[PDB]
Amino acid sequence: PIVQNLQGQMVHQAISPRTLNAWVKVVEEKAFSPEVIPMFSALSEGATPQDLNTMLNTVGGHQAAMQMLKETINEEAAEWDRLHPVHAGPIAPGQMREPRGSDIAGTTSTLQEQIGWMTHNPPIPVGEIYKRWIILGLNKIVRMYSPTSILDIRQGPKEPFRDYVDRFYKTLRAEQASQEVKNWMTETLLVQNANPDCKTILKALGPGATLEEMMTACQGV
Amino acid sequence: PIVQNLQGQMVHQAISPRTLNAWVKVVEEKAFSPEVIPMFSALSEGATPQDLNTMLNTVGGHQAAMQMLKETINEEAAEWDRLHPVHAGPIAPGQMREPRGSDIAGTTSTLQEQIGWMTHNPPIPVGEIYKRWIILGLNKIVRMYSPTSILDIRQGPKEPFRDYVDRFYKTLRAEQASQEVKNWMTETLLVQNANPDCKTILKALGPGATLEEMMTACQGV
Amino acid sequence: PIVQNLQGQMVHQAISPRTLNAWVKVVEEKAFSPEVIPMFSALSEGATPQDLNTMLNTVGGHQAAMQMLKETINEEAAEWDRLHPVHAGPIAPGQMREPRGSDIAGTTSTLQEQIGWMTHNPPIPVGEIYKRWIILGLNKIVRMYSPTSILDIRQGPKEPFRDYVDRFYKTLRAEQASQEVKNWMTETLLVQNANPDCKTILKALGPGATLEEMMTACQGV
Amino acid sequence: PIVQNLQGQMVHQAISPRTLNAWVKVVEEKAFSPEVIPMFSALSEGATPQDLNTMLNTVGGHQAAMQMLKETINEEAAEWDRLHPVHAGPIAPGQMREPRGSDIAGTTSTLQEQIGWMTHNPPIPVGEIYKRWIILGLNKIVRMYSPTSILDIRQGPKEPFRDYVDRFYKTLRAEQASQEVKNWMTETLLVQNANPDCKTILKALGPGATLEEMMTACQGV
Amino acid sequence: PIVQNLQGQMVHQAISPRTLNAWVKVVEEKAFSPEVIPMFSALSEGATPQDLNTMLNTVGGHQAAMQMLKETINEEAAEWDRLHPVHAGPIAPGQMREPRGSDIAGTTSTLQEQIGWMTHNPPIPVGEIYKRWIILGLNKIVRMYSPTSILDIRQGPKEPFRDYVDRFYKTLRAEQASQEVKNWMTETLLVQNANPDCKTILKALGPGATLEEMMTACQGV
Amino acid sequence: PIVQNLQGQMVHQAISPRTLNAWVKVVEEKAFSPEVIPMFSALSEGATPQDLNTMLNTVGGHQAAMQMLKETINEEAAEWDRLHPVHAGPIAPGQMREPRGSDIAGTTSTLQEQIGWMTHNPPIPVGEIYKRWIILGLNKIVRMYSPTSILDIRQGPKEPFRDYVDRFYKTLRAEQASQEVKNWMTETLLVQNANPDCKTILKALGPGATLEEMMTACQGV
Ligand SMILES: CSc1nnc([C@H](Cc2cc(F)cc(F)c2)NC(=O)Cc2c[nH]c3ccc(O)cc23)n1-c1ccc(C(C)(C)C)cc1
Ligand SMILES: CSc1nnc([C@H](Cc2cc(F)cc(F)c2)NC(=O)Cc2c[nH]c3ccc(O)cc23)n1-c1ccc(C(C)(C)C)cc1
Ligand SMILES: CSc1nnc([C@H](Cc2cc(F)cc(F)c2)NC(=O)Cc2c[nH]c3ccc(O)cc23)n1-c1ccc(C(C)(C)C)cc1
Ligand SMILES: CSc1nnc([C@H](Cc2cc(F)cc(F)c2)NC(=O)Cc2c[nH]c3ccc(O)cc23)n1-c1ccc(C(C)(C)C)cc1
Ligand SMILES: CSc1nnc([C@H](Cc2cc(F)cc(F)c2)NC(=O)Cc2c[nH]c3ccc(O)cc23)n1-c1ccc(C(C)(C)C)cc1
Ligand SMILES: CSc1nnc([C@H](Cc2cc(F)cc(F)c2)NC(=O)Cc2c[nH]c3ccc(O)cc23)n1-c1ccc(C(C)(C)C)cc1
Ligand SMILES: [Cl-]
Ligand SMILES: [Cl-]
Ligand SMILES: [Cl-]
Ligand SMILES: [Cl-]
Ligand SMILES: [Cl-]
Ligand SMILES: [Cl-]
Ligand SMILES: [Cl-]
Ligand SMILES: [Cl-]
Ligand SMILES: [Cl-]
Ligand SMILES: [Cl-]
Ligand SMILES: [Cl-]
Ligand SMILES: [Cl-]
Ligand SMILES: [Cl-]
Ligand SMILES: [Cl-]
Ligand SMILES: [Cl-]
Ligand SMILES: [Cl-]
Ligand SMILES: [Cl-]
Ligand SMILES: [Cl-]
Ligand SMILES: [Cl-]
Ligand SMILES: [Cl-]
Ligand SMILES: [Cl-]
Ligand SMILES: [Cl-]
Ligand SMILES: [Cl-]
Ligand SMILES: [Cl-]
């Protein structure tokens, strides 16, 4: 990775042994849970395309998800090549070539070119672009591996409201929907799918009720 | 995070693999105990909005508390926008735009803007403001998840005074009350709820008795 | 914490994740044994009031001792305010205000003020002053939680002298007494409370006998 | 290893105790699984020939693979000596001798010569060349130790498609074939070896079907 | 501790959390085995009197040995005060006072004075002097806690020579004797106390036989 | 140890707590296996004589091997003193004395002299010389502790060839023989000691057969 600074210039170091270990462990332990994506994002802070490819390569098993992840990278690289068509001509000294999708993914570029792209007067953040493409594929994998729908989340007749809200928002996290759709699920299904004893109490609170007030109201079931 | 210095300028680094691991572990182990908040505060020392969002994202489960935490952030961001109304105009070179609540929470701002806000001649500590908002929501979660009241804390007939004082102050820690209210509980309920054998001894000591003297007096029950 | 240097200027960093973890672990494992105090002192080397408060806040349970610790801090802060009466007047540029007990304890001061006090031409070591006050309270907690007296330490009829000396000096460590009192216990009770077979041998050695010579003499009981 | 920088010059450090430990552990745990190679590549980032030889030497057992690895290094060193024939003459001051295959492998060169080769105005990356030769031998070891063929990977009659795709791409990873051959296996054998119930559904999707769409289609077997 | 450098000046840091932990663990695990002393010496590399006192304070139990260790420190400090008599006079600016035994042990000196003594044009290594005194006391503790003599080490009738030599040199390590005495034990007792079958073979080899040749000769008992 | 650099000057630090721990652990776990020597070499990278002596001192038990190791050091130091006879005369300012074998082993030299020898215009690498002497003694210990000969390594009648080659090269690693002798064992005993079914197949392949081709040929026994 490359760690930035305020006065002077940055440095290029290797992915620390404990970063590699933590990434392998979280995949063995949690596989494709929604919280694995932020763990990957934080373990790959300041990573170059080579550093990001190194992380995905350390995954044993989960090969159907790794292949789906490559197909997503292909789509984002082919979209980049359509928006950014490279120009024919010899590259002048001082300046550097503009990157293609295969250079962002690390396939047709060198580590020196990646470092040179990320470290420039006008910076070319190829490490952040490739990471965005990977996280896109990882969110698809998470949504594909979720075995439930937010529509099936109903409160049990004797289940505490706090346990139902915990299962509600975990299920919503893995839903393939824009924020506006999720707000409609948040403001409609939570009360609509609560048990009859809770549902009546929540419906009396009205439209301005916070989650805190709703949880306080359904304490005695 | 950004680690400050005395002579020169600061540096911007990533959240270390062991900081991420310790935060995930303390949530699995202790969930919403009052001592988890200082652990979060110390693990997020010098954090930017992105670094703070990264920490909350690594939480698996506890989704009702995470949603309550978002609603608290919304309230503090809407209060910030009322106190600090942004001005219409093109931002001049050298200077930078004044932050909105959505920039402090990391939603409508970039990492570069967050670093630029925290590192300035007149500093804009967006990392500390967002952290204050998070700790506010975390204290509400702790108070909401406490299953007891300081009023129900009575000393057992054969329970050593030291064990009753340990249960008294743990229960008080999670109480939703200002310091003045807590001092009234400290100076009234401790002696009032002690067992008859202890209560008489503590009442003889009077008003100037320290906790140390009270604990020394109730040694032989 | 703030790590000092020889040529140049110091830096202000956060309490490392392993320092926080080691402190929580030693409290779960050993609670208020005399050796916990030096562990705290070494884990809080170069700490500011905020860093010291962070450490005490991470303690789960042991709330009677934490309250006793606050009352000790109150006494030392009120003694500081009596010895160091602050003066009324606007603080001049360049110079900084003189600290009160509530600034040393971190309650009515900011991290920037604490850093500014510890880093100055004439230094104001508020971090070391608060740490001294905490260690005072911790020694009171250790003495309060010791369940034995040095007077009750007698050697068993078949107990090896080495085991009796180990129990003697551990018990003396938690005694509330000045060094001069402890030397009188060291030079009087050790031989006086040894078993009759050992006591006679030690009494023949005389007044100039070292602990090494005493331990060598009582090898064969 | 040697960690590069942007402004100034690099430094030469030792292989950290945890890098050595992680490498020994991954060999005891996973032996010659395809994901061990990227772990080696990341643990040997910026390594000199001596640092790379140190890593292979720490392997206990797996001696048939270590001997096969030496024979591969011999072939790559003899190919280097054919492409790069050294010239007879005394080496001038300032300049340095051009490396032979035995200098790249660390046998007939010193650590100072390796550091001098990697750190130069026109750099001679002997550390990266030797690492390429090692990874070549490691890929041969992985292919030699794979106990299955991509041709034998058929879907079970009651086996979920996701489990069959996981076993398909793991088996393909260890296949000794160029990327073009692997694409023919990817576009031909996956559907051809699926169970009759899945095979019919996949064949209806056609030629433009992604892995994501194929996995979505075979959800209900 | 204080870590030295070549170009510039040194820095003063705290005893790392893992150094404190490793020291506590080796005492719980091995107590006063001869190999604990080098572990202490390496964990206290570059330590000041305060850092050395911090390490001994973290020892739980072993209080008879800790008291014996204080008495040894007293003897070395009183010997220092006899060899180095301090002079009466006000200390001039720039220069610093010459240390007493109580300043070397950290009792009547401050951390700043210890740093100032170790960092000077003519250096006063108080950290190394106190460490020498501690290691002296630790070697006495090791010799006092050894439960065997080199004279009692005889080879078993069916015991392999290698096992007898291992028990011989471990027992010699804890012997209270100068190097010349130990060489006489090495050149006399090893062969003299070997079993009759080995003793005859070793006696035929003569006076110039190495340990390697002796071990090779007694392979078949 | 002393970590070298490119622009400027090196630094002298202590052996890290985890380096000391890893060295003690590998000796408890593997004792004198051939792979322990490279672990020692990598854990002692950039070590001074004092740092190397510190490592050997941390070994509990294995005292016959530690004594054999001292006798080897004695031989290499007496050979150094024969090749490098020191000259009588007062050492001039600026220059430093030429080292004897007892200075290289750390017995008659100080840490400052060792640092001064390794850091010089014409460098005197006493740390590397002593390390070479130690590794010589360690290889003798490994050869002395090997309980088998390469001549006794025969393939089982039902044992897979891969398992026989693994046992062949592990046994050869601990053989006391020059590289030319080992090549004769590699090119003669491997095929000569294979089982009759394998031996015939390997003999048909001829003289140019690689280990990879030999292992591929004996797959079906
Ligand atoms: C020098 S560029 C680089 N270096 N390494 C990698 C990727 C890293 C990787 C990516 C991924 F999406 C999932 C992974 F599991 C691994 N490794 C791999 O393909 C190795 C691999 C993992 N399983 C397999 C199953 C079958 C197989 O035959 C190979 C593999 N790339 C890289 C290669 C191709 C691409 C495109 C997607 C653009 C075609 C991108 C990067
Ligand atoms: C680029 S800004 C950013 N990046 N990440 C985050 C927060 C981080 C987070 C915050 C929190 F209070 C609790 C969390 F668990 C996580 N992540 C999330 O929402 C992800 C998430 C966690 N569970 C869920 C259940 C349902 C769901 O659909 C999503 C989630 N934000 C962020 C987003 C919104 C907000 C407002 C509160 C202002 C609306 C603030 C920050
Ligand atoms: C921004 S200053 C600061 N920040 N944090 C702290 C202390 C840190 C702390 C101190 C202590 F002696 C024992 C502790 F366990 C914790 N935290 C606390 O009180 C939190 C706490 C721990 N259990 C409780 C049980 C009941 C309760 O209602 C609260 C708590 N202070 C701080 C507060 C007051 C004081 C005085 C003693 C001067 C009144 C000093 C510091
Ligand atoms: C100062 S150069 C250096 N330093 N160390 C090494 C290699 C490192 C190593 C390489 C490898 F491919 C596999 C290994 F297991 C180890 N160590 C070794 O041979 C030691 C070793 C491991 N098992 C053995 C079984 C039998 C035996 O008699 C010895 C060994 N070389 C090195 C030596 C030779 C070569 C050529 C391949 C060019 C002939 C290259 C490097
Ligand atoms: C600011 S100087 C300093 N700071 N801490 C220490 C020593 C550190 C220590 C030394 C030792 F030899 C053995 C130890 F276990 C601890 N701590 C202690 O005495 C605490 C201690 C450990 N068990 C005890 C049993 C009884 C008791 O009443 C106290 C204790 N000194 C220090 C004190 C005295 C001396 C002389 C030997 C010169 C009199 C030297 C240093
Ligand atoms: C300030 S020089 C230094 N500092 N420490 C050491 C060695 C380090 C050591 C070396 C070794 F080969 C094996 C070891 F186990 C330890 N320690 C030791 O002898 C301690 C030791 C380990 N077991 C023993 C059994 C009996 C005994 O009476 C002592 C010991 N030397 C050192 C001493 C002598 C020599 C010569 C070989 C030249 C005579 C070299 C260094
Ligand atoms: Cl690791
Ligand atoms: Cl509930
Ligand atoms: Cl979407
Ligand atoms: Cl609730
Ligand atoms: Cl970790
Ligand atoms: Cl009590
Ligand atoms: Cl409040
Ligand atoms: Cl009590
Ligand atoms: Cl940790
Ligand atoms: Cl005894
Ligand atoms: Cl006292
Ligand atoms: Cl004893
Ligand atoms: Cl390690
Ligand atoms: Cl499936
Ligand atoms: Cl190929
Ligand atoms: Cl699926
Ligand atoms: Cl630790
Ligand atoms: Cl033997
Ligand atoms: Cl002696
Ligand atoms: Cl032997
Ligand atoms: Cl450690
Ligand atoms: Cl085989
Ligand atoms: Cl040889
Ligand atoms: Cl094979």
Side-chain angles (χ1 to χ4, degrees), chain C residues 143 176-178:
Chain C
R143 290 175 265 133
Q176 39 264 47
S178 66

Side-chain angles (χ1 to χ4, degrees), chain D residues 17-18 21, chain F residues 18 22:
Chain D
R18 72 188 160 101
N21 183 59
Chain F
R18 72 188 160 101

Side-chain angles (χ1 to χ4, degrees), chain B residues 170-184:
Chain B
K170 171 188 288 219
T171 312
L172 181 55
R173 197 180 183 169
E175 279 279 327
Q176 39 264 47
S178 66
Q179 195 59 55
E180 197 173 355
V181 171
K182 294 190 176 183
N183 292 347
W184 173 89

Side-chain angles (χ1 to χ4, degrees), chain A residues 2-3 5-6 8 10-111:
Chain A
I2 304 171
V3 171
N5 82 335
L6 268 42
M10 300 147 292
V11 284
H12 172 64
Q13 71 225 272
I15 308 167
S16 70
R18 71 188 160 101
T19 303
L20 297 163
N21 183 59
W23 173 239
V24 165
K25 297 304 157 304
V26 297
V27 168
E28 294 174 346
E29 300 166 351
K30 306 158 177 179
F32 299 109
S33 208
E35 78 272 14
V36 183
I37 313 171
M39 194 54 79
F40 175 75
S41 314
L43 290 162
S44 54
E45 281 168 305
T48 67
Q50 170 178 118
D51 293 322
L52 300 152
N53 280 322
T54 291
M55 291 176 81
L56 301 173
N57 280 338
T58 64
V59 177
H62 301 291
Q63 287 306 296
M66 302 318 287
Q67 174 64 34
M68 252 179 68
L69 182 52
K70 292 176 185 163
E71 302 186 351
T72 295
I73 290 166
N74 283 329
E75 287 171 335
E76 295 306 311
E79 184 68 13
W80 171 273
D81 288 341
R82 192 187 62 87
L83 289 181
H84 304 79
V86 86
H87 282 53
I91 307 302
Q95 289 239 342
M96 78 188 302
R97 109 251 190 133
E98 240 46 48
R100 263 176 49 92
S102 65
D103 302 325
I104 298 161
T107 75
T108 320
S109 80
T110 71
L111 182 62

